Amino acid sequence: NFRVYYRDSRDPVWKGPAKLLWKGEGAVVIQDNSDIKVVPRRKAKII
Amino acid sequence: NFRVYYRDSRDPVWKGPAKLLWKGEGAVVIQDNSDIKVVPRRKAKII
Amino acid sequence: ELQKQITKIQNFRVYYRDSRDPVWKGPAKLLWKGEGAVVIQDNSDIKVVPRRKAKIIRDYGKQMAG
Amino acid sequence: ELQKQITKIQNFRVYYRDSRDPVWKGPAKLLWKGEGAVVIQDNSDIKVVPRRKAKIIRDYGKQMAG
Amino acid sequence: FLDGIDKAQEEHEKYHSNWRAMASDFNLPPVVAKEIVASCDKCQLKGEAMHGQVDCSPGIWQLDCTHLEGKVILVAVHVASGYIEAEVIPAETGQETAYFLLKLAGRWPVKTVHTDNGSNFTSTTVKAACWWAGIKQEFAIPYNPQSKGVIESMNKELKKIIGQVRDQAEHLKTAVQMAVFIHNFKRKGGIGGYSAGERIVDIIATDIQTKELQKQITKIQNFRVYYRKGPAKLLWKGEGAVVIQDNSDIKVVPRRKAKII
Amino acid sequence: LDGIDKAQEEHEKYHSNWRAMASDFNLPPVVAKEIVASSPGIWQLDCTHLEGKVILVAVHVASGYIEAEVIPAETGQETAYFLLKLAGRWPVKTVHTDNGSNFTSTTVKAACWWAGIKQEFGVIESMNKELKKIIGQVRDQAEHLKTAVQMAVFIHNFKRKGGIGGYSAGERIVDIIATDIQTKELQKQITKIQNFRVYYRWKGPAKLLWKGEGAVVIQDNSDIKVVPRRKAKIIRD
Amino acid sequence: FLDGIDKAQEEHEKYHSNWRAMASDFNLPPVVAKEIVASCDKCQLKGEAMHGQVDCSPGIWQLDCTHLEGKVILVAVHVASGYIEAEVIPAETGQETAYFLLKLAGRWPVKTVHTDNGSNFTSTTVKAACWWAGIKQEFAIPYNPQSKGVIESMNKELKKIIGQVRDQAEHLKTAVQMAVFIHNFKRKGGIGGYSAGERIVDIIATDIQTKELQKQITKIQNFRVYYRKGPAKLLWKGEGAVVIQDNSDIKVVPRRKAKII
Amino acid sequence: LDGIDKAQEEHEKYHSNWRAMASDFNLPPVVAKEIVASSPGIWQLDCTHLEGKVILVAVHVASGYIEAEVIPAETGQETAYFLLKLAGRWPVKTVHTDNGSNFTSTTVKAACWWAGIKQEFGVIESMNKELKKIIGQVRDQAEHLKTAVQMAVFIHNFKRKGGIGGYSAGERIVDIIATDIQTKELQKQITKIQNFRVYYRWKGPAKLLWKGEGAVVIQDNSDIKVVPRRKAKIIRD
DNA sequence: ACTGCTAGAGATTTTCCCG
DNA sequence: CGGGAAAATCTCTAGCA
DNA sequence: ACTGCTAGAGATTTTCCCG
DNA sequence: CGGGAAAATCTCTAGCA
Ligand SMILES: C[C@@H]1CCO[C@H]2Cn3cc(C(=O)NCc4ccc(F)cc4F)c(=O)c(O)c3C(=O)N12
Ligand SMILES: C[C@@H]1CCO[C@H]2Cn3cc(C(=O)NCc4ccc(F)cc4F)c(=O)c(O)c3C(=O)N12
Ligand SMILES: [Mg+2]
Ligand SMILES: [Mg+2]
Ligand SMILES: [Mg+2]
Ligand SMILES: [Mg+2]
Ligand SMILES: [Zn+2]
Ligand SMILES: [Zn+2]
């Protein structure tokens, strides 16, 4: 599996780790505490 | 001589033409209506 | 018959990009067009490009100018 | 005497940039140091760099490691 | 490095040193220090340095609202060509956006629209307008203008042209239409050295012509190709290479180890 | 190149246009245009009344593609705004009008002057009738008449299909504008190359037709001749 | 092209077409259309696309003020090394800035400071402090943070480290000092793989050593070189090339056509 | 390489340190350190009273470089803040104190724990006297005592010059810290290379000294020998 | 499961043109 | 095949707010 | 007469290591 | 001289507000 740390929306604080669900070119779909978020790959780090 | 069009300070409107006095690497000194201004070469066009 | 149609298909030029390259590449020659993928020929190299990453034109300047 | 001092001068490494190039270039060898200009030797090529565009260090890692 | 690793993790809990510092100060291999950094949640504060690429299909239009002189300007761009369509509207209301999008659909073959998550673009009236005209709504990731960078740069260009030609008109709407005209037909460049209008006409005509020609070719040219597999469909052959489509997966194989039936 | 004699024979036999010869015998369009030599901007403007509101309808004559919207009043300002929009969206060169009060106002004339449109004072009536029919068909799906008008424009432009090949008005106008762009491209190339004179083998001046990579195509005494680049010189006059 | 030029200038007064459009639509050469555009004041709206480079001499320090948690943080950076010095101050006042700069001058060899045109940095108290310590004030072009990009990026880095280590401290000033410590001694990278403190020590020691060594060399090595001219001073010779200084103009000439006396 | 015997002879004759041999005979520092083998972090802290205000003075013992500022009160919080600042600006390893109330408080101990400083409880008195002399000299140029204290620190650190070579305290501390950085670099290189064993020509294991580009320097039976890369193998143990 | 881009200002490289 | 000039291409930045 | 930079996350290229 | 692995280098982006 993977760990994702991200910067969701207008919040400069980084959040994580989240479960990586889908990895596309430019954006990733993640799950953070039963919440599905779509984050651009600029604002995310996958480990 | 040269014509300089520039964007001085927090004003999105471009002004000119002005007399070019000194051309350095990264900035230019100009004269616009007996007023001496130093403008970065990013915010200026010299013709 | 078929050869004329193939020649017309190959008369179109495609501008395209790669997944990690942000600059548009030159006018490759169009070989095949699909719903989601186009087949091109760029400098003696055949590539498959997603339809969302390709701009297929003709260039009437060129056409009417050799 | 003089040769020892010249060898010590050439033992320093200089990081520098050009007027229109924003990336710092590799550790060239220092030949001469002035008030406003330094003379370097980068890959068998001698250049004159303004003092404001050069970072002259020694690199104690390297020194104490060959 | 068991002793060194413990002294580096203990230091990282205090200083959050980067991998280079702990590698130097505790004789750790670079991979070990990188593992130490990567396991600290407090040091995960930077995303990867790349950019995505927007959809450039001929049917995609990017819409956005901009503000000038206290008014609202609704702007649409054809992504493939740069052809723009702008109009001053009384307010950022789903009714105005629905009307503008219905006009756009009635003027050009609009298949899908890519907008941000503004209130007007997410209204049920706009959804009903898109459903009637068969337009597929794609909404960007919230607070990511880079998803609609095309329409954002078009807003910049339109504002520049409006500033250029503001004196010739007395109202803002006349100047907006004048700027649309100037951008669409008086500015050349791009892929074909075209204007926006010439490029969009070329794009749509090319789509139609290529669709019809490929339909005729596929109707006439019917063959099965065996390579290395199953009866793959033949797409293009020649120049020592064959392009085939097996199980909706298009691959290019050389003429060798391939037979056309 | 080698097909110039075949193209001349084909033109003498069948009087084919330069498009057919360029598409068949693999010739540059300038050579074909010389051999054969040896509407897209037309719009009609009208005002139509429906349920007490004024609808300004613009039709592309060569294709039947319509541009209509409900305007608040039959005033020269509104129609000038409409025409400026139309010029900004399509290459409008001239508009046909019915000498109405809103079409001969000074504002509309100024709009035409700025947009480079010439004003000149049966298809429009049939187009208005068809638009009214479609509006009556789709009125029940819209609360306001302006939304219904745009629905009718969409339907007429992309859903109703008729003609020889069964294309819609949008496809027809796209094809027509593409053909006009090709025509303008060819005209610009002809104008660019017409200022040159060529001397070959040295013979008299010859009008230049094409400047190919391996040959130069010229015209001398109403006859087209192909000469190599290495046996001729081109000068500007 | 006399007729074409007039029809293009007349169109440009209306549309301000770019050079490509008028070159295409009026059969103009590219230079003529570019001349038409370049003579229009309304189309001069973009500067040249480059960047300058900040002074990187060992004596330059860049100062700036940043704000965090409602407090003011005064930050200084040594440009050549990245060594930073930060301190929470009660207000952006010339007294506090003068005190901070006097401290900085008393701690390190500060020869010149590069700041923006804030009120605190332009106060007469700061000027008097610089005069007493022999510091030369360089003020950036107004509203151009790129002139102090070094201290701006250092503000970003300091804020990131403060966010990392905020929980370990109860006040902001303690966390600021902790972040300064971490940046200066617990983060490696850069030219020598150094920390900021190691790099600044190396820079200053190298300056001193090179100055002394070059002074001794110039005292011992005294020669005049004639090339192609006057008695140019000899700076460095060898490897088929000679470096000379004629009339305060340093030039490099090959060993040929040069004689050392 | 070839100068190893000369370096051994020089060490046997004059007992020179590895620095001199590495600077003279052109040897890597590890080889010289092996041949010779075959304070920078020290600070003193004190509190001084002047005109009813408390001045906290930190001196670098090996150089005489001072760090002083006027603190609002003689409290462990203030001195902990001062020491955290000092650690953030200079590589402070241990501080000497006089068992005062503000130096044995829990806050200062926590600051030392976080900054990696060891607390241990004549130069400081002379330094305080010199600081007082300079403060009295430059008091007339400052309205507040805190500004005058910083002026005195600046003067003592960079203007007053004395010693063998006539350098100031700032140059001395810079040189000392540079030497300490060199020492730490050499120690890290020694630790990195000490985990290897070399077999040459195959003989018994030999401690690795240098891994030059054209040769490998090793030690066998208290003797340094140079072998080619192509006649020896290096393994990690 | 989604995604920076665009147009202009200089600088540098290719190509065309007559020898 | 060789320079010069012109054209094409590449690089790079602000604004979109 | 003055001037974007820095540090980290991936991707790609060099170099070292044993054969 | 040849692959693999590790290291070095190059590319590229956000935030500084
Ligand atoms: C309330 C709606 C919906 C929710 O979000 C807000 C805020 N917003 C902000 C920008 C903006 O930041 N433009 C500058 C910019 C910066 C970077 C870049 F890559 C592209 C860019 F255009 C917009 O353009 C925009 O349309 C909106 C908007 O519409 N809304
Ligand atoms: C009132 C003082 C004096 C007059 O001007 C203002 C406003 N200002 C604005 C920024 C700023 O825009 N930072 C973001 C940023 C953007 C681009 C870039 F290249 C570098 C950057 F840091 C500053 O940092 C800053 O110190 C000031 C300031 O101090 N003042
Ligand atoms: Mg928006
Ligand atoms: Mg926007
Ligand atoms: Mg500032
Ligand atoms: Mg700032
Ligand atoms: Zn950490
Ligand atoms: Zn203009």
XYZ file of C-alpha atoms in Angstrom, chain H residues 40 52 83 85 90 95-96 116 120 124 135 144 162 195 197:
15
model
C 36.098 25.197 20.207
C 21.526 48.651 37.948
C 21.806 30.216 25.747
C 20.243 31.927 20.970
C 27.541 29.148 17.279
C 29.117 25.975 29.000
C 30.980 26.823 32.211
C 22.846 19.323 23.250
C 29.816 22.287 33.998
C 35.692 35.411 32.327
C 31.351 50.190 27.736
C 20.726 53.370 26.510
C 46.153 41.634 19.708
C 35.113 -0.787 8.743
C 39.628 -4.874 5.413
